[PDB]
């Protein structure tokens, strides 16, 4: 769904590639109404349309606005900031280092100076958790006029305020329409509307001075009237219009026994809303939650349709491969020689993999030797990464990422910098080579500064992406046409021109037929060394007991019964090489003793008990 977007989690760290940093933000927020993490707006230039932020109404985590030369940041409609994650772990709103003292970089008579001017938060009437940090904005006005105690929730511990008010600019008074002299800006529309301190007795939020005006106990930012259904924002969960404290549980008590879900009504907690099914990429627990990691003593299982859930390990919980950012690798940050052997023979990684210079270079104080390129083939068996994949560094003796040629999915439930499920920078590989990769579950893809990397536009990126607000961000790789110039283009057999690299082992869909992992013109349905059939565009072998049919088709399935015409002796179940003599059919069953005919048929033969017939043999 659009209207939900992921957080971000980069704090003050500089954009990985600045040339595409504004792009990531626009994709990531263009249609968004609820951020489900941190809204972080850092390093934005002076002339920078931020028109895409206009629809943001809730922020689940914190709001950071830091190191930007832009004058205004249009978050007018933003109403609540729940502060589930905090910046510096003690601030829901943090506003830092926006105007640059600038050093007369511009002419002495600059058209105007840079730096945020007013906060313009006409609708922020709720901060459920966390304080306010405001430092070193020289053009900033009105930060100190606001009454922040009104915004902080009744129950907001951490309601601290450190607000520098050093300004290079004198602030014109609040518009005269703002009796009280509290406002977010010069405009008459910027007056701080009050909803907590101006309340009648024993309430929490209110529309006005009296007890008629008091908001329902499940409201959070105010209300247009008294009922639940009348809130602006819900303290907990928006159950399709009504604000409630819990989502309806999924085990009702029918009057006669503990029956199953009121699920025509029972719902899953997903953020601050009740939903019927968890959205894509999230797991369902049995406790009515939508999650990104399962509960303890639990296992991720799947379903034929696609849905993933959590259920109890009724056995001992079978042991798993953790990636970085999980358990014993919770804070380690690189795949190195000290831990490479832990991923040996893993189909699926719970967590992430990052490869930094320190992986392949020494780091001798650690005493961890450099990672050998031979060691990377630990990952041949790997089909699924639940976290992200990040590669700052890669052996130059390797052309591609074939080591990960059986990677099918990257879930992106954990995201690098909070934003990216697949990042690749500074590598000088020549093509990607992830022939199996079929979906990036969450997040964007960032592929930049790979001098020799071709085979980027050849990838059908749009069919890896699931949720909107996913994109490929790319710059500073090798020029597309400098690639086809040198003879790097998809194999002619690659359907629609999509490949991960040179040759017929790298197509996305073969145009014609696929034998194994290579595209081919013809299966061996007629003229064939080994005879084979077709099945959903594949060449799969016939049974070794089907007989080659010179000119005509040789089989219709992989089994021996499926065969056209057997090459030796037949037993009705299927084509066989040797008629059975006294094999164990079951642990406690009679032995089947048969013999050939001249007709090739295995017929049973007459016996008593102790001596039998095996073509004249006891």
């Amino acid at each position, epitope marked *: 769904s659009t209207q939900v977007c992921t957080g971000t989690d980069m704090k003050l760290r500089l954009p990985a590639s600045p040339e595409t940093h504004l792009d990531m933000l626009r994709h990531l927020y263009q249609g968004c109404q609820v951020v489900q993490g941190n809204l972080e707006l850092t390093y934005l230039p002076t002339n920078a349309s931020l028109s895409f932020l206009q629809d943001i109404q809730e922020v689940q985590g914190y709001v950071l606005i830091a190191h930007n030369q832009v004058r205004q940041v249009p978050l007018q409609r933003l109403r609540i900031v729940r502060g589930t994650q905090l910046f510096e772990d003690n601030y829901a709103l943090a506003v830092l280092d926006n105007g640059d003292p600038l050093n007369n970089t511009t002419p002495v008579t600059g058209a105007s100076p840079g730096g945020l001017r007013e906060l313009q938060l006409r609708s922020l009437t709720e901060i459920l958790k966390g304080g306010v940090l405001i430092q070193r904005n020289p053009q900033l006005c009105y930060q100190d006029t606001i009454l922040w105690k009104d915004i902080f929730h009744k129950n907001n511990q951490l309601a601290l305020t450190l607000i520098d*008010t*050093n*300004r290079s*600019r*004198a602030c*014109h*008074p609040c518009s005269p329409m703002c009796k009280g002299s509290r406002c977010w800006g*010069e*405009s008459s529309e910027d007056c701080q509307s009050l909803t907590r301190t101006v309340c009648a007795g024993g309430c929490a939020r209110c529309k006005g001075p009296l007890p008629t005006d008091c908001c329902h106990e499940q409201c959070a930012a105010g209300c247009t009237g008294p009922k639940h259904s009348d809130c602006l924002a819900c303290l907990h969960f928006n159950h399709s219009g009504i604000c409630e404290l819990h989502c309806p549980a999924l085990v009702t008590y029918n009057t006669d026994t503990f029956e199953s879900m009121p699920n025509p009504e029972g719902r899953y907690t997903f953020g601050a809303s009740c939903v019927t099914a968890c959205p894509y990429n999230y797991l369902s627990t049995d406790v009515g939650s939508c999650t990104l990691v399962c509960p303890l003593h639990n296992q991720e299982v799947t379903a034929e349709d696609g849905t993933q859930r959590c259920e109890k390990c009724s056995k001992p919980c079978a042991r798993v491969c953790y990636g970085l950012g999980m358990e014993h690798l919770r804070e380690v940050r690189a795949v190195t020689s000290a831990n490479i052997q832990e991923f040996a023979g893993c189909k699926k990684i719970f967590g992430s993999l990052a490869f930094l210079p320190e992986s392949f270079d020494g780091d001798p104080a650690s005493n961890t030797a450099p990672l050998q390129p031979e060691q990377l083939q630990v990952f041949e068996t790997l089909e699924e990464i639940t976290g992200y994949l990040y590669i700052s560094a890669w052996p130059d003796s390797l052309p591609d990422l074939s080591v990960f040629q059986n990677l099918q999915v990257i879930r992106g439930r954990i995201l690098h910098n909070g934003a990216y499920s697949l990042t690749l920078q500074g590598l000088g590989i020549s093509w990607l080579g992830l022939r199996s990769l079929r979906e990036l579950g969450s997040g964007l893809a960032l592929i930049h500064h790979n001098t020799h990397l071709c085979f980027v536009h050849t990838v059908p990126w749009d069919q890896l992406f699931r949720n909107p607000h996913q994109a490929l961000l790319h710059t500073a790789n090798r020029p597309e046409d400098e690639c086809v110039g040198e003879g790097l283009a998809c194999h002619q057999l690659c359907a629609r021109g999509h490949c991960w690299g040179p040759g017929p082992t790298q197509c996305v869909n073969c145009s014609q037929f696929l034998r194994g992992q290579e595209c081919v013109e013809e299966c061996r349905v007629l003229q064939g060394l080994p005879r084979e059939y077709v099945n959903a565009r594949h060449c799969l072998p016939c049974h070794p007991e089907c007989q080659p049919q010179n000119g005509s088709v040789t089989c219709f399935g992989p089994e021996a019964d499926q065969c056209v015409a057997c090459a030796h002796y037949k037993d009705p179940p299927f084509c066989v090489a040797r008629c059975p003599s006294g094999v164990k059919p079951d642990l406690s069953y009679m032995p089947i003793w048969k013999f050939p005919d001249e007709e090739g048929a295995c017929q049973p033969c007459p016996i008593n008990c102790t001596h039998s017939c095996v073509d004249l043999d006891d």
Partner: single-chain antibody
Amino acid sequence: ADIVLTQSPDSLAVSLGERVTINCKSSQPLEYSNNQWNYLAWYQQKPGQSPKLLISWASTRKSGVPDRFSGSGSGTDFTLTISSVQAEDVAVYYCGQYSDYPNTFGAGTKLEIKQVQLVQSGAEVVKPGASVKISCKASGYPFTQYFIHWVKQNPGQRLEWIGQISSSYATVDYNQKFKGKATLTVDTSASIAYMELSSLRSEDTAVYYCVRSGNYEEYAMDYWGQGTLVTVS
């Protein structure tokens, strides 16, 4: 174009208890787009001493100044009125706008019958063609939360705005008339503002006032220092 403020009565001689008006017209309207505020203050200079603010925002009266003094007007004409002039009220009263840079003042009007502290440096005698650096030490208020201006008052006693320095970032706006002439500085660590008059000539003979200013309702310049006379040989 610079905003010209022209006051109507050059001087009024008058009986105790009588009612007076003093009028001020400006060449453009002293308002800002976003607000209905009118960016005009009235100041009182009783001889011997520094000007003091009575009424900012035209309508609004500074706290402490008696009820006889009242501000009237909006748009382009403003009038001060004293219900009954007392013996304490013999002074020169200066019109003063702060809507557009440069800040301008009015000619003055002398009426006749019938805690913040900015401590300026001592007086100065200066050879024409040399330079001098006058100081100003602030006290009784959070220094970095306010601005500091410089205003010249010349022999004939009219007022010219020199400039403004932020007392935290040290950024300065100048009047173009004083670009070569004055340079504002601030040692924020000591609560001193400075000004440096350079290449002094005869027309720089004047008294140089240091004037505080703040934010929002306290936008207008409120507190003046005692003055430094700089006379050139």
